[PDB]
Amino acid sequence: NHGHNVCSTWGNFHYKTFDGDVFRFPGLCDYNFASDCRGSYKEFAVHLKRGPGQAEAPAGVESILLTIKDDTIYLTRHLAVLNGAVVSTPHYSPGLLIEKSDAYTKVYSRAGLTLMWNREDALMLELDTKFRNHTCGLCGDYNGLQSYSEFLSDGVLFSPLEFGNMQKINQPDVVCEDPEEEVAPASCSEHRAECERLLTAEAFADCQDLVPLEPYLRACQQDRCRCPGGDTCVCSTVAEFSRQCSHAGGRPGNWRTATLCPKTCPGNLVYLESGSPCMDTCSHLEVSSLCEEHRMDGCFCPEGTVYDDIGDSGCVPVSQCHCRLHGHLYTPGQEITNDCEQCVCNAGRWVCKDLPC
Numbered sequence: 001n002h003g004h005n006v007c008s009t010w011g012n013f014h015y016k017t018f019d020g021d022v023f024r025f026p027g028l029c030d031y032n033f034a035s036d037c038r039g040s041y042k043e044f045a046v047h048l049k050r051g052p053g054q055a056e057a058p059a060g061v062e063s064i065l066l067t068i069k070d071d072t073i074y075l076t077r078h079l080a081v082l083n084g085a086v087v088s089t090p091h092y093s094p095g096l097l098i099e100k101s102d103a104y105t106k107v108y109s110r111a112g113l114t115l116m117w118n119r120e121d122a123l124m125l126e127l128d129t130k131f132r133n134h135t136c137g138l139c140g141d142y143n144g145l146q147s148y149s150e151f152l153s154d155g156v157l158f159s160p161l162e163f164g165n166m167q168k169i170n171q172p173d174v175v176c177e178d179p180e181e182e183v184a185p186a187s188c189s190e191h192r193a194e195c196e197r198l199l200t201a202e203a204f205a206d207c208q209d210l211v212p213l214e215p216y217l218r219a220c221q222q223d224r225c226r227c228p229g230g231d232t233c234v235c236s237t238v239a240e241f242s243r244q245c246s247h248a249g250g251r252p253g254n255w256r257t258a259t260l261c262p263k264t265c266p267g268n269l270v271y272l273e274s275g276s277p278c279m280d281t282c283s284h285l286e287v288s289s290l291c292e293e294h295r296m297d298g299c300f301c302p303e304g305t306v307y308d309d310i311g312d313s314g315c316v317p318v319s320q321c322h323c324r325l326h327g328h329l330y331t332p333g334q335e336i337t338n339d340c341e342q343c344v345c346n347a348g349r350w351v352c353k354d355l356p357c
């Protein structure tokens with residue numbers, strides 16, 4: 001019942017600004033995704049390295065670089081690096097939480113910023129309202145007005161290709177070329193039946209009045225003709241419609257089937273288009289007020305088990321949780337000594353009785 005202000009990218013190079021513009025930009029270089037370029041003190045910058053990837057399939061993301069106040073976060077498909085130091089997840093530090101699920105790597109900042117990446121095509125940034133009118137990059141100016149509704153002095157308009165190219169971050173001594181102006185961009189108009197059939201299904205009943213349907217249709221027509229092999233692209237776009245509903249306070253239903261884009265989780269994890277934002281985990285770090293936010297898609301543990309974010313052994317009973325200290329894993333039962341307390345790993349927590357010093 002309470003939404004967020006999100007900019008996102010997914011699938012075959014689709015982008016969505018804070019203000020709701022959806023465009024395609026197929027650049028393969030490093031870009032300014034979103035920045036506090038108007039702050040008197042710059043509070044954040046998010047850079048998106050696309051890298052090379054496979055055509056006629058959703059586009060890859062090589063890495064993400066986050067700067068927030070005095071902290072630097074570098075994310076890849078396998079790495080999480082904090083101020084140059086490789087870190088284990090979950091990682092908690094002052095007003096910054098990095099955590100890794102099977103569905104998403106997520107970054108949470110007390111500076112007014114949350115970031116979620118599925119470690120493939122789909123990336124998404126929620127910002128606090130205090131950053132209205134403050135932002136640069138592919139995500140727009142966050143000012144409450146759309147491309148179609150606007151133009152600048154001297155009749156300056158930016159096509160999606162040159163707006164994207166303007167955000168390129170050049171690396172000394174590395175060559176990376178913009179994409180070439182696309183020859184005859186055919187506006188695939190003959191698949192609208194199937195696409196609208198999909199974004200109107202009973203599963204998006206709640207979403208029809210929360211998320212504007214027209215931008216996602218045209219992106220869905222684009223998918224059906226630029227990605228003619230299979231359904232990989234057009235299901236990124238239906239997933240994104242689902243995601244936009246959830247981030248706007250709504251509850252999409254389960255729209256996937258055995259033939260209509262199956263999605264399964266490892267082990268005994270359950271895929272839900274909309275589950276709790278807060279599950280118990282072996283680390284027990286998910287206790288902040290983020291538990292009061294809207295529901296989201298992902299992989300969830302069956303009742304009676306907790307997600308083992310410490311020893312990566314799936315959904316376990318809490319009594320079988322690993323503990324962690326100074327980079328080392330511990331089994332339930334093992335005991336450790338610091339000073340005047342000896343601590344035992346119990347149910348994923350370090351329970352400590354005091355001793356004489």
Ligand SMILES: *[C@@H]1O[C@H](CO)[C@@H](O)[C@H](O)[C@H]1NC(C)=O
Pocket residue numbers: 132133143
């Ligand atoms: C942001 O900018 C728009 C257009 O310039 C303006 O209408 C709006 O009041 C601004 N928001 C603020 C100052 O919070």
Ligand SMILES: [Cu+2]
Pocket residue numbers: 003004006126246247248294
């Ligand atoms: Cu949200």
